Tab-separated table of C-alpha atoms in Angstrom:
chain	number	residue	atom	x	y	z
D	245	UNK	CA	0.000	0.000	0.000
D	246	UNK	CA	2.225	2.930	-0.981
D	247	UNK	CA	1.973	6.091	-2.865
D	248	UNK	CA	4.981	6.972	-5.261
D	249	UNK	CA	4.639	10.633	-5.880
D	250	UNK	CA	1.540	12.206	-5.886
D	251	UNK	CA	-1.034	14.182	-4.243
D	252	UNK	CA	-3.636	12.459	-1.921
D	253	UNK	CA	-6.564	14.400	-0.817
D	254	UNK	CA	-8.981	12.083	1.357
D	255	UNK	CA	-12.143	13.253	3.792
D	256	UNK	CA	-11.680	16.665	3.354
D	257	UNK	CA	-13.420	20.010	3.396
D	258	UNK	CA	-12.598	23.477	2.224
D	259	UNK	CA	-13.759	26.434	1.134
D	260	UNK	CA	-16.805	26.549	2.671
D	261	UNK	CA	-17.680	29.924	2.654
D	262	UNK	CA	-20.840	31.472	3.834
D	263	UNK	CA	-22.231	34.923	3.990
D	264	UNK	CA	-24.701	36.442	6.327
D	265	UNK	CA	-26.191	39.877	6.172
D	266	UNK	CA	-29.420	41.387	8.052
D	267	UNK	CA	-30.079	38.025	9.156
D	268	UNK	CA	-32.814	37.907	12.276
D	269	UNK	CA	-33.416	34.601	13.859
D	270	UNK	CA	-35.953	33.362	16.705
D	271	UNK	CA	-35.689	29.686	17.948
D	272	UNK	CA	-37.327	27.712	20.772
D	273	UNK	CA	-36.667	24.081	22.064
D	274	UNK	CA	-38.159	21.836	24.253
D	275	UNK	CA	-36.117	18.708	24.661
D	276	UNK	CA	-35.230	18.063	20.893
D	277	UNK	CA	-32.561	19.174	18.753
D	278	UNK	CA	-31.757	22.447	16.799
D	279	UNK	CA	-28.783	22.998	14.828
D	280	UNK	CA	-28.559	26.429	12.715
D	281	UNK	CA	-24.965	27.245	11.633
D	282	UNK	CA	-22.028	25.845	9.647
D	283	UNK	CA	-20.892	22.493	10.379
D	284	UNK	CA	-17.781	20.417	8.746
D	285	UNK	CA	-17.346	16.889	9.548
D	286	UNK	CA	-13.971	15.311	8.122
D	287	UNK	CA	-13.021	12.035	8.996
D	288	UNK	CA	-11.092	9.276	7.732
D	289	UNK	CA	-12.532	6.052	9.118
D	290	UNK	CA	-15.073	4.748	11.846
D	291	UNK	CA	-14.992	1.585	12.668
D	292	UNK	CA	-17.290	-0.467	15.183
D	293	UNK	CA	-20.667	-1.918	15.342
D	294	UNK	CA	-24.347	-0.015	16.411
D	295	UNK	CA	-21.801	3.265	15.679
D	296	UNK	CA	-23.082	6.548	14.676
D	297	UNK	CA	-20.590	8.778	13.012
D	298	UNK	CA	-21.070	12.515	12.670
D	299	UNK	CA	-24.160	12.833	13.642
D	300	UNK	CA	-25.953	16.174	13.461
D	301	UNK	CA	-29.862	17.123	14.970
D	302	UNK	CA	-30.264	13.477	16.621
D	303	UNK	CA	-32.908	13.202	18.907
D	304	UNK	CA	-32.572	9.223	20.023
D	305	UNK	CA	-34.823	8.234	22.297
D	306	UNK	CA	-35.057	4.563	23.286
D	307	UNK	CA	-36.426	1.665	25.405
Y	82	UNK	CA	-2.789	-0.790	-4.119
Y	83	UNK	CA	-0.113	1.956	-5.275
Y	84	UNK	CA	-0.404	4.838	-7.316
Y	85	UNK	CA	2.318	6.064	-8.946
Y	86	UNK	CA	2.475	9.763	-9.873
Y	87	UNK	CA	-1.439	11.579	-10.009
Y	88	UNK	CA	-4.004	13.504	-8.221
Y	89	UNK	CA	-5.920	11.213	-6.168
Y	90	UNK	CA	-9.208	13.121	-4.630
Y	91	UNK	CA	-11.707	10.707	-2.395
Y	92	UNK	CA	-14.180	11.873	-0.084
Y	93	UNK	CA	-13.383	16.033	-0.163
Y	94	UNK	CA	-15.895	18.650	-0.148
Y	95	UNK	CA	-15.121	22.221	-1.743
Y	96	UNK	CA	-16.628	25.401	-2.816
Y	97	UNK	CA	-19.445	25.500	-0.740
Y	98	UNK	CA	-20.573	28.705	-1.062
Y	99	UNK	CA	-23.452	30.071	0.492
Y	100	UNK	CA	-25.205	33.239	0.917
Y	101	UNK	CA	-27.979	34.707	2.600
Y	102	UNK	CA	-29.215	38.610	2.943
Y	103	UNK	CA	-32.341	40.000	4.866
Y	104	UNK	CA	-33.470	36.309	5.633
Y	105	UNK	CA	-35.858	36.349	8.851
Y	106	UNK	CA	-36.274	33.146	10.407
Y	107	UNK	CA	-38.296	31.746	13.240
Y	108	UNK	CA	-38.656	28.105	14.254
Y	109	UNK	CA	-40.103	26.124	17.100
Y	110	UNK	CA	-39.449	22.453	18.323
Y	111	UNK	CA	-41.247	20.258	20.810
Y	112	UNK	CA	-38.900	16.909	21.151
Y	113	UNK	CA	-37.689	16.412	17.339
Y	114	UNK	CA	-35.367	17.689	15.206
Y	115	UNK	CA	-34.439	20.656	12.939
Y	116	UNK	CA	-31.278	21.888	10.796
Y	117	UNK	CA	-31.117	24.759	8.936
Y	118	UNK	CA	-27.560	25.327	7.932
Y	119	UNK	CA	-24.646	24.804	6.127
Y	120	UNK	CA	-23.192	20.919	6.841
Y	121	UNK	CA	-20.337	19.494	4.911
Y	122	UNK	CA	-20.002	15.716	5.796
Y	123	UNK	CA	-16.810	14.247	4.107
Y	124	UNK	CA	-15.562	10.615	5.177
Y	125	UNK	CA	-13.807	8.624	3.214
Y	126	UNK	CA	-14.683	4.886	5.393
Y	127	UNK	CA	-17.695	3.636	7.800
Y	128	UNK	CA	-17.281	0.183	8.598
Y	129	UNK	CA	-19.702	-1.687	11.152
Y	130	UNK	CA	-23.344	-3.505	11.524
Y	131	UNK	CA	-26.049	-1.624	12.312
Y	132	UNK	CA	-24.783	1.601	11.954
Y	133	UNK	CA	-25.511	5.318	11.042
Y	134	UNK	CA	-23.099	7.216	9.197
Y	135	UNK	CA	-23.360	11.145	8.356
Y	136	UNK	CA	-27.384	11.196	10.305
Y	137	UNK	CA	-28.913	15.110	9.770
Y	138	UNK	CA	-32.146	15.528	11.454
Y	139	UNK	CA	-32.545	11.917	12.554
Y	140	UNK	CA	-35.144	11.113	15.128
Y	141	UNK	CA	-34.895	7.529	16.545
Y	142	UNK	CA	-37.433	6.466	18.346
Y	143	UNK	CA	-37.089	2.724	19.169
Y	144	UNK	CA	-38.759	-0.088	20.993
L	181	UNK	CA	2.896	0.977	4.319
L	182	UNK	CA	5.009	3.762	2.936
L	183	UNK	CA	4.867	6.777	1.004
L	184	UNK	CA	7.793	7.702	-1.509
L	185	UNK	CA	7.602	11.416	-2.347
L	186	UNK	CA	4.109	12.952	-2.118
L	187	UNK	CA	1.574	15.056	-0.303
L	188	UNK	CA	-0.701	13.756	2.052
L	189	UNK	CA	-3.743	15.159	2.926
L	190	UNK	CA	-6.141	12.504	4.718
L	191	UNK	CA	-8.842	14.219	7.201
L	192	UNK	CA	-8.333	17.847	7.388
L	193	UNK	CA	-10.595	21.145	7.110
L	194	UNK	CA	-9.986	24.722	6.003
L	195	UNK	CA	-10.584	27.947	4.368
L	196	UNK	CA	-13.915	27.490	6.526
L	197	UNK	CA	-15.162	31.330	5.851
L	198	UNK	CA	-17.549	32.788	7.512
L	199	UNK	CA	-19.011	36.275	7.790
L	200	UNK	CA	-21.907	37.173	9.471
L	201	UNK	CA	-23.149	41.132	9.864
L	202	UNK	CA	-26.246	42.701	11.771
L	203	UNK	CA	-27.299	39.352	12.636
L	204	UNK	CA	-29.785	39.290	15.793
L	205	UNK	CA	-30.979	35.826	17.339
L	206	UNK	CA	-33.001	34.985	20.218
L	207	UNK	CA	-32.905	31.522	21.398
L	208	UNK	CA	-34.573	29.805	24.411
L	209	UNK	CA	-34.049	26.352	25.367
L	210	UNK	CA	-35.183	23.792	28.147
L	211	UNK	CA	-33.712	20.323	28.106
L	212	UNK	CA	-32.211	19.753	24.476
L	213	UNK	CA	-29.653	20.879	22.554
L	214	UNK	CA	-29.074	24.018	20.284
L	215	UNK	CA	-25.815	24.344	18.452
L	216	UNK	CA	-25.494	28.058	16.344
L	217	UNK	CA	-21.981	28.686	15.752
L	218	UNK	CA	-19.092	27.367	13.481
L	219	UNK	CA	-17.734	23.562	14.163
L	220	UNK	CA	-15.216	22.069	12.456
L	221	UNK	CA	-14.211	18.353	13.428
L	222	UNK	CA	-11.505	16.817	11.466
L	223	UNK	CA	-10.360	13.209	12.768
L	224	UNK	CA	-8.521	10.344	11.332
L	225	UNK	CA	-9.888	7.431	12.843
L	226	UNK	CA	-12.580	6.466	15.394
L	227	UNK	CA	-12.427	2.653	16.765
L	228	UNK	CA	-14.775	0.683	19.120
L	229	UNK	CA	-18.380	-0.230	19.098
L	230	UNK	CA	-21.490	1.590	20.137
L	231	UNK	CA	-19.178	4.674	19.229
L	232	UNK	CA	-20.253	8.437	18.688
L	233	UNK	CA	-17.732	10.388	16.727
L	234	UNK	CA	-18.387	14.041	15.871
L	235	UNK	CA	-21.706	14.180	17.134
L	236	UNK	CA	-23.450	17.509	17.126
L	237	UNK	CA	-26.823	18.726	18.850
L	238	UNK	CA	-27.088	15.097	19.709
L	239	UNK	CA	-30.146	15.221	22.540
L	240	UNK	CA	-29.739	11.442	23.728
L	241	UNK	CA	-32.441	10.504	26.605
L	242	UNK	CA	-32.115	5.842	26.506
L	243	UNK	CA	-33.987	3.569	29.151
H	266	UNK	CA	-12.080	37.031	-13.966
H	267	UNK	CA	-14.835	35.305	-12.047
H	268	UNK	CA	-17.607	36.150	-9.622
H	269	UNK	CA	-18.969	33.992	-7.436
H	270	UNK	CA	-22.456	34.918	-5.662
H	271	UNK	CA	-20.505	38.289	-5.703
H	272	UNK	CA	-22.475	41.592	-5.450
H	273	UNK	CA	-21.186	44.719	-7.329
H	274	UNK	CA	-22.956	48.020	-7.662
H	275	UNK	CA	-21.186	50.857	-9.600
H	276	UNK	CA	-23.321	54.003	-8.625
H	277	UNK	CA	-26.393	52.757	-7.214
H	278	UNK	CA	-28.411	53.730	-4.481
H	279	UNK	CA	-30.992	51.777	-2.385
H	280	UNK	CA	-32.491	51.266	1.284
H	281	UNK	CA	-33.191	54.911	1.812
H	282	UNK	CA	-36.710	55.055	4.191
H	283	UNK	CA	-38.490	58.348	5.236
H	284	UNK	CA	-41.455	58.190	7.900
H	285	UNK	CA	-43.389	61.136	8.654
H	286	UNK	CA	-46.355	61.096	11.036
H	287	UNK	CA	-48.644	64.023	11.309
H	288	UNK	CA	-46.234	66.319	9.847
H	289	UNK	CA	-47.420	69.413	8.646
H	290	UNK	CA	-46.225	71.804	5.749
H	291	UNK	CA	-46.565	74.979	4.015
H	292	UNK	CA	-45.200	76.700	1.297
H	293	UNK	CA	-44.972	79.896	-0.672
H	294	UNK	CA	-42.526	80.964	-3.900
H	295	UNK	CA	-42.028	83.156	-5.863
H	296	UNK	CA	-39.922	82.572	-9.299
H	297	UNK	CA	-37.399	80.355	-7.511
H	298	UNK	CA	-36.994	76.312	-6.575
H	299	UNK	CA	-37.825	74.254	-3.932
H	300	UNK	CA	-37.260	70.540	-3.020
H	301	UNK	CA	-39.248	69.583	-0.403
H	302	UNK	CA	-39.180	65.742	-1.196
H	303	UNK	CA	-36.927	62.738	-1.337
H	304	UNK	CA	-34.723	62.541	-4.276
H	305	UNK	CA	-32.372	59.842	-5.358
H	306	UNK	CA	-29.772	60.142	-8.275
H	307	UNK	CA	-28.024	57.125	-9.624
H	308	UNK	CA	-25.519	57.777	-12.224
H	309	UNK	CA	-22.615	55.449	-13.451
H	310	UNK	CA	-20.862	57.937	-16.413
H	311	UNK	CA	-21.657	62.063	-17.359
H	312	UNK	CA	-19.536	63.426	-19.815
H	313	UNK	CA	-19.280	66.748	-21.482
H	314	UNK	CA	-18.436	70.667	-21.321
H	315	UNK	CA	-20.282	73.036	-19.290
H	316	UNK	CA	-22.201	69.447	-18.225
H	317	UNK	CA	-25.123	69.966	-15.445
H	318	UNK	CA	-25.741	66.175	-13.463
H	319	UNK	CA	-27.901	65.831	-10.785
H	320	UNK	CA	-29.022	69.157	-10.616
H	321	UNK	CA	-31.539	69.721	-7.713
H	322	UNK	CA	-32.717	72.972	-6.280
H	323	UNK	CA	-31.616	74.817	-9.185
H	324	UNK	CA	-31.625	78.251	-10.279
H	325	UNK	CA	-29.577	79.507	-13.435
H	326	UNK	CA	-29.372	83.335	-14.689
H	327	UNK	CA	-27.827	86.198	-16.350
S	141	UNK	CA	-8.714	37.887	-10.284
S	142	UNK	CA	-11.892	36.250	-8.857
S	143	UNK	CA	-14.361	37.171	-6.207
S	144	UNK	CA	-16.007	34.700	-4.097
S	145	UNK	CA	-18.628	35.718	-2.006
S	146	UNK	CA	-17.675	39.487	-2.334
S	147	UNK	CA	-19.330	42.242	-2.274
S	148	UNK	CA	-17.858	45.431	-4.175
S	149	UNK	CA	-19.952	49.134	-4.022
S	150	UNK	CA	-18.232	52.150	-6.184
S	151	UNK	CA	-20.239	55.019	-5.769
S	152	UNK	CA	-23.104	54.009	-3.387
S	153	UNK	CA	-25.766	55.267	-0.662
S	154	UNK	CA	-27.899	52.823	0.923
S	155	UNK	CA	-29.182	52.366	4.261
S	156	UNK	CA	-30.670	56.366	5.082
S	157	UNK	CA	-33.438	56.511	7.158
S	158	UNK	CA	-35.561	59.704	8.023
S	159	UNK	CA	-38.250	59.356	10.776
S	160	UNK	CA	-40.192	62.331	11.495
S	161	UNK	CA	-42.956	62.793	13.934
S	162	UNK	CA	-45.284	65.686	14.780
S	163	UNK	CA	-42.579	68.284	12.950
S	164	UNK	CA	-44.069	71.487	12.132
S	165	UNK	CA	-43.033	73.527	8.847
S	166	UNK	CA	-43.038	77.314	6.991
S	167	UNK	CA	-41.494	78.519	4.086
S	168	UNK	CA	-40.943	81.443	2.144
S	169	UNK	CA	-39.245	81.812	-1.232
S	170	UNK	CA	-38.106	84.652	-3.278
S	171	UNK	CA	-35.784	83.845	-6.305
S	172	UNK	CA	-33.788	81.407	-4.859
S	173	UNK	CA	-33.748	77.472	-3.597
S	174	UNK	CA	-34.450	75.946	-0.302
S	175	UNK	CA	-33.993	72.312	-0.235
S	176	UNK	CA	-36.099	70.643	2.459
S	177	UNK	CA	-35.655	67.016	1.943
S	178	UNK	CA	-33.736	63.840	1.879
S	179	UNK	CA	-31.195	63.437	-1.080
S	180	UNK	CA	-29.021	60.856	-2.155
S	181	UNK	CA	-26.462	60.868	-4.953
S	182	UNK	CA	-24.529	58.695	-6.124
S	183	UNK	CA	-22.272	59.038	-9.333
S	184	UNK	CA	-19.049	56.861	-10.364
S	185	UNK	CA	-17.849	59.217	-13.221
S	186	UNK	CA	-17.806	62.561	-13.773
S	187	UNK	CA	-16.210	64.558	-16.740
S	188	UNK	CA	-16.219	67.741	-18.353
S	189	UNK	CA	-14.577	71.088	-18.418
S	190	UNK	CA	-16.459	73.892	-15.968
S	191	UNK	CA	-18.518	70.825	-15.021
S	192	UNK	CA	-21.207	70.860	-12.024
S	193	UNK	CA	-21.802	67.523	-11.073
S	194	UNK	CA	-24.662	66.671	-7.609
S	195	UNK	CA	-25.475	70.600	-7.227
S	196	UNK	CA	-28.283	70.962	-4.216
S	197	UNK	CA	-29.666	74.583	-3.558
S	198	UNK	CA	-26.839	76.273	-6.120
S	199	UNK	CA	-27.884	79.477	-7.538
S	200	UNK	CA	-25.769	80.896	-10.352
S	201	UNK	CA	-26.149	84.438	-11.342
S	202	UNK	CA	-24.248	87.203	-13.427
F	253	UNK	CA	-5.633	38.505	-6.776
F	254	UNK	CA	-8.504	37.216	-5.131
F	255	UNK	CA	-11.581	38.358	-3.016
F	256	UNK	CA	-13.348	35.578	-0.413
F	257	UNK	CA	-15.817	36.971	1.250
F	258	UNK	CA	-14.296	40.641	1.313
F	259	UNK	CA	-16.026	43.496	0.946
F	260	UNK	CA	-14.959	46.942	-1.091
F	261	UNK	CA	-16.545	50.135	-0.851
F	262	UNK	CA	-15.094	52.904	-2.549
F	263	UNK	CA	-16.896	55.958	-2.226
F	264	UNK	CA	-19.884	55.061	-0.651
F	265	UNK	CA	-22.199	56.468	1.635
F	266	UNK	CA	-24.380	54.204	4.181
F	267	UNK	CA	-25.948	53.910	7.555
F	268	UNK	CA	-27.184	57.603	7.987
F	269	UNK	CA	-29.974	58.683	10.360
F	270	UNK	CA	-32.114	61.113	11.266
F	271	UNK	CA	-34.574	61.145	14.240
F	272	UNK	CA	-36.627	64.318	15.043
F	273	UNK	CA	-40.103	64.449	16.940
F	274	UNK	CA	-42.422	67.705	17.313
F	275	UNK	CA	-39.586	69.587	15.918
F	276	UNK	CA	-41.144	73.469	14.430
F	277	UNK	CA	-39.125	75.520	11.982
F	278	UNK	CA	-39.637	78.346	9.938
F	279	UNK	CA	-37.603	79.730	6.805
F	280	UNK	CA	-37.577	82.942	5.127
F	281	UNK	CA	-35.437	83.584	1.958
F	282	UNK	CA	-34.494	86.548	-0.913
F	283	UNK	CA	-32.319	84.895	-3.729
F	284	UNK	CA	-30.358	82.632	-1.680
F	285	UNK	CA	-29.766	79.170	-0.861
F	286	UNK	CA	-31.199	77.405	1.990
F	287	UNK	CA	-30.215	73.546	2.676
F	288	UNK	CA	-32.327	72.261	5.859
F	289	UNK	CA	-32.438	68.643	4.982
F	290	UNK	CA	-30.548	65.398	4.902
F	291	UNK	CA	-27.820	65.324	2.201
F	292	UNK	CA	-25.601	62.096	0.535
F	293	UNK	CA	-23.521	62.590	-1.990
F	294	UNK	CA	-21.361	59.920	-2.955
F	295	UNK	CA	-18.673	60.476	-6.444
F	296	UNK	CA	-15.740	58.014	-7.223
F	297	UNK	CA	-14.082	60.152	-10.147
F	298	UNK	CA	-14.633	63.742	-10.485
F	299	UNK	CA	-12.211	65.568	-13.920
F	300	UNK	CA	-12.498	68.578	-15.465
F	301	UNK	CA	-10.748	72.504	-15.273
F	302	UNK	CA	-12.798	74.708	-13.259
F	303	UNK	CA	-15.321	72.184	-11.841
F	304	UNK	CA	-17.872	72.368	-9.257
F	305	UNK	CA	-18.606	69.257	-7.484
F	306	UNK	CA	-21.014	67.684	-4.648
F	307	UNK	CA	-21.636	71.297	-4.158
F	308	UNK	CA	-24.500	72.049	-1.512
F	309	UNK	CA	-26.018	75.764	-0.675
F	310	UNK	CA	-23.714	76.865	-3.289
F	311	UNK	CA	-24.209	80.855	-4.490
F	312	UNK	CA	-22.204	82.081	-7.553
F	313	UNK	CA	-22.237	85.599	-8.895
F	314	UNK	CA	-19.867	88.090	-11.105
């Protein structure tokens, strides 16, 4: 498993560019999950069973 | 598994632009979930039973 | 395992711009989660069962 | 050259606002201007010799 | 040369606001300009020779 | 050259205000200028020989 020469660009993120302006926002929670803004998850691997990986606004409720 | 001389891009995320001007939001939530926003999820591996990779907004209820 | 002459780039994040301007937000929470704000989670590996890697906003009640 | 979700105004003008509540007025001339009102002049290029652009309130003689 | 996200104003007014409550007003005029009221210019080029470019209330005479 | 997310205001103009409750005001005038009210003048290239501009309340004579 090798790399001679090259470039190797794996789970990555860039340039994620955002704006705003004037924006007004109201929220309200009660027990759940709110997610309002930027959010970059890069990984590689995950390994392992029943896992959750980058998870984002998970409500898990469970008996 | 070898490369020799390239540009190898897996799993990458770029030029995510986003913009927003004069937005007015308002948002309420009793026990779920809610996403409003910019998410970038780049992985290049999940392994594993029974998983959950890269949720958004996921509500598990289970019994 | 080896790499000759090369550039590696395996689970990384940048350039994450963001500009925000005469934003107003009200928020109220009771019990759950509220994530508003810039996250950036860059990992190589996550190992083991009944794992959470890069959660986010991750309301988690179980019985 | 490239723009992405750029913005670019050359010589605009926009987001003016003017309230009044029980304003009142009165006026009398005689042979000479007056601007009472909102006014709003957007001009990207004038040229000339003696040129006149965005004139307002005027008066001119001889 | 490339913009991303950007946002590029040459020669721009925005965002004025005027609120006005309960205001009284008189005028009188004889022959020459009064200039009451909100005004916004806005010009990116300009040329000429004995030019008069975004004049309010001028009066020229001779 | 490259803009992200910048932004690039030359010669502008921008988050003016004016508040004014139960204000009263009264104006007389003979063959002059009178400027009471809110002005925005914004230019990015003004040429000439002799030239007259963003000129406000402006009296010329010979």
């Amino acid at each position: 498993v090798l790399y001679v020469g090259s470039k190797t660009k794996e789970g990555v993120v860039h340039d994620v560019t955002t704006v705003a302006e004037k924006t007004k926002e109201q929220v309200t929670n009660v027990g759940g999950a709110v997610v309002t803004g930027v959010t970059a998850v890069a990984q590689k691997t995950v390994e392992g069973a029943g896992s959750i990986a980058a998870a984002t606004g998970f409500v898990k409720k469970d008996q």
